[PDB]
Homo-oligomer: 167 residues x 10
Amino acid sequence: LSKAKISKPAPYWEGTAVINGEFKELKLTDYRGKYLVFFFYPLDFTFVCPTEIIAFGDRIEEFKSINTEVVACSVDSQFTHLAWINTPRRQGGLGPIRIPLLSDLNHQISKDYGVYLEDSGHTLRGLFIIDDKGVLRQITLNDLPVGRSVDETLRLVQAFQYTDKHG
Amino acid sequence: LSKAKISKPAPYWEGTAVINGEFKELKLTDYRGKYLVFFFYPLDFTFVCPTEIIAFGDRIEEFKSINTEVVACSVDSQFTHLAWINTPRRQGGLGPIRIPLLSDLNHQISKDYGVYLEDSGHTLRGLFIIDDKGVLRQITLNDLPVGRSVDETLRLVQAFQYTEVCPAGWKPG
Amino acid sequence: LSKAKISKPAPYWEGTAVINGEFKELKLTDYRGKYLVFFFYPLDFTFVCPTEIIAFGDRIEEFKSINTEVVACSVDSQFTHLAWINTPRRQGGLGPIRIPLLSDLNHQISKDYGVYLEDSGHTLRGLFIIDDKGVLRQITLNDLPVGRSVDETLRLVQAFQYTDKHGEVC
Amino acid sequence: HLSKAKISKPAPYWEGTAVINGEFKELKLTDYRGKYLVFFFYPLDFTFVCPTEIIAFGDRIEEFKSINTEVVACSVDSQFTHLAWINTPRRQGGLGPIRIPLLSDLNHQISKDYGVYLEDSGHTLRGLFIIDDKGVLRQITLNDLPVGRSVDETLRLVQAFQYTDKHGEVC
Amino acid sequence: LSKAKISKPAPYWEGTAVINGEFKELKLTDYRGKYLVFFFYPLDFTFVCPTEIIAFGDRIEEFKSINTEVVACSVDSQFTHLAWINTPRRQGGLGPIRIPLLSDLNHQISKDYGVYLEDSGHTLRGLFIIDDKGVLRQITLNDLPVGRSVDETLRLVQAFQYTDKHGEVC
Amino acid sequence: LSKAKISKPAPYWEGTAVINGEFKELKLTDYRGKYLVFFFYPLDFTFVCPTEIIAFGDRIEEFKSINTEVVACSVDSQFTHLAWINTPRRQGGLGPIRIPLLSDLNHQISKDYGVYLEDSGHTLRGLFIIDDKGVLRQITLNDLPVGRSVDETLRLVQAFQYTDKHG
Amino acid sequence: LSKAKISKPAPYWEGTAVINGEFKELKLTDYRGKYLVFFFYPLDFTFVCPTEIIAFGDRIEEFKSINTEVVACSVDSQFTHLAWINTPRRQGGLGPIRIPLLSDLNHQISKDYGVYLEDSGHTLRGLFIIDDKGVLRQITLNDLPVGRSVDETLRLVQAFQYTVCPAGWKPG
Amino acid sequence: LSKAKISKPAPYWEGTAVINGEFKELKLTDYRGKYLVFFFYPLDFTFVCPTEIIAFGDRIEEFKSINTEVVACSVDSQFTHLAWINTPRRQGGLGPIRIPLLSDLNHQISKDYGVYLEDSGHTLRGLFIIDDKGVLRQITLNDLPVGRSVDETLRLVQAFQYTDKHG
Amino acid sequence: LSKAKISKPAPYWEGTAVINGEFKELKLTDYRGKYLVFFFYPLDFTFVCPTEIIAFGDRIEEFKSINTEVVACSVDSQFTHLAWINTPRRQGGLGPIRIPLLSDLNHQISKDYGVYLEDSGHTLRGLFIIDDKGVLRQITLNDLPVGRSVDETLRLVQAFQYTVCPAGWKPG
Amino acid sequence: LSKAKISKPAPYWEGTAVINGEFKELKLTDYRGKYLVFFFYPLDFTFVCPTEIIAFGDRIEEFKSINTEVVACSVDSQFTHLAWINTPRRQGGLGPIRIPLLSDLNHQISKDYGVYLEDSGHTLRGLFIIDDKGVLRQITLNDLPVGRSVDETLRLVQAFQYTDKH
């Protein structure tokens, strides 16, 4: 069922994302000419602190300077994404964030990337690296407990870029 | 794909609901011996005031007095269901509410009741009435914009339990 | 087997109706440009008073004034529809009525709207609301005992027309 | 889905609600075992065509009853429309009172089993079947919607069947 | 399997018939413009007196005066048909007869008219009435023992001729 | 559709035949223990002289004396088979005959034997030789014009009976 | 699987035959305008006297005088067909003969005519008569032991080309 | 279609072979306990000198002495095989020979060995060496013209025999 | 065709590995009761410095100390694995190493893990972390150029075994 | 599954070979116009003396002289072929050799030729002779232990060249 294959073109996706507090139509092709770090996380409004999403949002600049963008995705509706941002931390929210939050409500993107859990109705923790020519170069799939490293994602992006010229 | 047929047993469902600020496992079979008004609404945290859901929460006591329970369902996570209730009504939330909010995250229940929109990724505005022996007795499917009446739902339950009036002079043969 | 989907075009139909005491060929498209309340009822000439059919005939003036029409339908022949109308209320009849009675004798329309009961040989209690652009906007299906509200139908039609201009309001 | 009605095979089973002397009674084909049954379809109640053929059987039913024979009529109309028809006076468009049952085949099962249902019109041909005391179909008569039916020819036919059941092979 | 449907054109057939002792190629289309009584009987050279064939042969003139033609049919070879006619009535034959005897040897026509018995290898007693435009108007199927009324057959054509112009009127 | 295979059992058949002026139920198994010449001919009451059938009827004793029986078959009814026999030769008949005339009116036997003509509604000229064990040993099929040999049939039966004992 | 049906065209065949000590391509259509007796026999070099094959080779002039040729066939190679021919009859051979010996080594021809015995690896005793327009007119299939009569074959052919009733008999 | 796989048991075959002028039923299992050189050749009575087949017939004793038998096979009938053997080498024949000529008339053995040529109706030049345990050990397929070495075959068999003990 | 699903039991494998210079049958079930890092690398005897394999071999003790084992796999024969190890680092070889090198010569294992490249005939660079109960917990797949972090692998294993919030953050 | 048929064109193959110490892309069509001896052997770095592979490498000049080429093939990577050759004949290696070593890493060629073993993951000992027109002429399949004769291959090639004329 998964369309995501390494060194084949990354599966096309499109949907509504929340960017800087507004709804915007986002597509994989918007990021052509740049590397894109594309990752799924299970759910909004959970009891687990969203450290990993904040960590990417805070340090986004390290990505921007190496021609990389970052996009987060969950199966939550784009309306739920917003409420999370607009919900105070004492009550569980995310607060403002500097990466787009993409909604995969009809589950289609999750399924194409092969990270959807048929029975849970939400995603794995999956992260995909797609290059500037629009090709999937790396796949990371974690069981539900384990978080994700900003440093390690960076190491990977740089290594792909370095070998893009000299190998 | 739809399993809901009138006067056949209502399709079984079970899932996580938010009841009185807590997560509780809820299944259709829990409502045996009582009538159940089971209705879907599209999404939480929208910009449309959730009056229909609220109206049921406010007047929930009138259903209780005629042996009827009410459960609402959307395709949202129970975690989102919780946040909505915990978001003040003044700030766009649902606020506290006295009916359970059932989560159909894997979409399995929506599809069973035939209210899921494959391309939109959420439900219609759909309402089902089920009797105490667990049989589907009424189906209401609305296009997304139009809301839903408590009075009319009440009228229907009473009408299924009890059994507009005849013009004077009309007689049968 | 049912073809009726919300916000897809309402399924086409045509058949012979009794309108103001005459047989007339009626088709769904005749109601283009107006909202149509199209509803089924089980049978003519039963022993239960047709309160729901009469109530629509009496209050028809309220539907026409918001550019809405009403058509009732059963699996009975157009000839049985006529006899019913031409039979006095004191005699079990409907008496004269101001909405058309459409005959779905060969059961094709009932099947298309998904309200036909295979074993009983008649319809459910079903009501569909269709807009001026010919799109299905509402489906209501009741088990045999429970009747149908004119007020609630008027409310739905009004709500659909209203949101057709200002999309969603409190 | 096609006709089940075959000559000299057991007659297709049917059961449904009929109007008999103004009342609803559950009726089945097996109820007529031990007697010959004349079972026929007519298109619709409440038409502008005179129900002369249905009436003629009702008037002359006794000639059939005396030769160990029953007669039953059927249309695709509801038992309620059937009743309404009988209780409408004979000249002001009704059938008037009748002494044979009017079987309602509202769900069309019997009409399709007998191969007399018209898919597009939603009613029957004019068909008459003669069935014996062992429940075996012996005769099929199908008329285009316009032509009516002879009680007499039916009467003779019932008689010819009765004769050949005992002394059959010779003129 | 039967192609004979009431008020649709009668199933086409063609074959060799015996007419006045001669072999003749005969088709349904020869009877365009006239009413045709077309009927099957089980077998030739049987022990049952062939009265119905004779009775029709005798009164053929009444048919001709009301614009009706008649054709009899069995699954026997045309050759068997001939021997029968040429066999004296005293010897079990038909003797000469004034209606054509059409041969349906390859069983194709009995099957089209839905009158063939798979196991017997011959027909039921079946009669079909066809109008001047070639449309099937009546079907009569008798179990093998019972003979047939000329009179009733005569009546039916008249009822059809009568209702083709005025239609049934009270 | 033909069931007739050489040196496999000849296909079973059964039906009503006219044997010595009476109707009799005849079946292929009645000839167990004897060789059987089973042949088809097109029709009774034709304008062609029935020489081949009469030739078999006349010389039947030569067959009985080599433990062989003979049966003729056409698609005509047994009532027609009787009438033919009972029709004087002068008036076109067969006259009395000492071989059975099998009626295959429902065409079932012809179809089993591969001699039925779909379009004509009668048979080919076919002859099958079946042994004492009910096994088909020889198949002969002629186009409509050509008749059939008693001498040659006889030669064939003898050759089969001879080689049944001494190779 | 058999393609041979009466009064339909005889199934096409072509292959290498031994004709006058030589290999020649022979196909059914070479015999158009003539009747052909095309018959199969099981095997070359047996201990059974090839009386039936020889009889056809010998009396061949009688066929030729009624516009008919004869071709015999077995599943043996044309080489074996040849060797059979170059062995004297007294010494078990066929000796030289005046009908072609068609070789069906790959069994393709046999199968088309429905005479191949799947398990034995050779043919039945089968004989087919084909008319001058190339249409199959007669089929004779014998179990393995029993041979075939030239007289009878001849009789059949004349009758097909040609186209005696009990006394007192007349038709009606 | 070929059933013959290296180091799997050689495909079973059985049939009539010609041995010392006699017909004898022969099967592969008869050669258990001995190595068998089983080879196919196209046709009897061909115009090609049977040098390769005779060489095996002449030198058979070298095979018998290293516990090996040799059997040749063609699709020719056992009756054709005998005639070949009873035709003198001087007459285009094979003359008497001391290895069996196996007949694969119904082609079943050829097909099993994957050496039947569908359109020619005969075999390739194919050779199989099967060890004493009934296991296929060696496969050789030659174009139609080319003859075959006894010397070379013996070398291969011995090597198979040698490695049956050492390595 | 891939069998590797997260939080389902890891796909079974068995084959011959080279461990401390010897051939051994190694199977996934041998690592029951321990976490296993199971990773593929494309090929032996390449011109690319085999740093990632060596780095794991050098720091293997850190894994051993958190009850974790490491096994490397390539589609190379076990014989090639041995020659690699017995070829000096000075000569381009791997030299001795302290993790087993599993040979997947018939490609069967690679296909099960969905790491085989059909046209190239070897694997991408893929790593799987499997728990002590034998369940696949993590999948990492890299295009051929990019190596893999031991530190990062370590972080991951501890994380699975162990189981920092924005300030002000509290749950409902 | 095997596509290799006698007196039909040899199945096309192409891949990377090690030729006289270098990586080179090689295809069957390169041997158009000359005879080619194409043979498989199981694995590099085995414990079996590569006497059969070496014998062809040593006497290569006799094949070159009858317009014939020889190419050996195994399922090992080309990197492994090289490493093998660069391992001295004394240390268990093949040492330098004068026939190309073709790598069939993705198993595609072995399978086309019908010598791959699904369960073992390597080839049989199989050798094929293909003529100057690219037609498959001879097939040899040995169980894994047993070597192959240079002489008999030579005898066969010559016999084929001979019948190419007469």
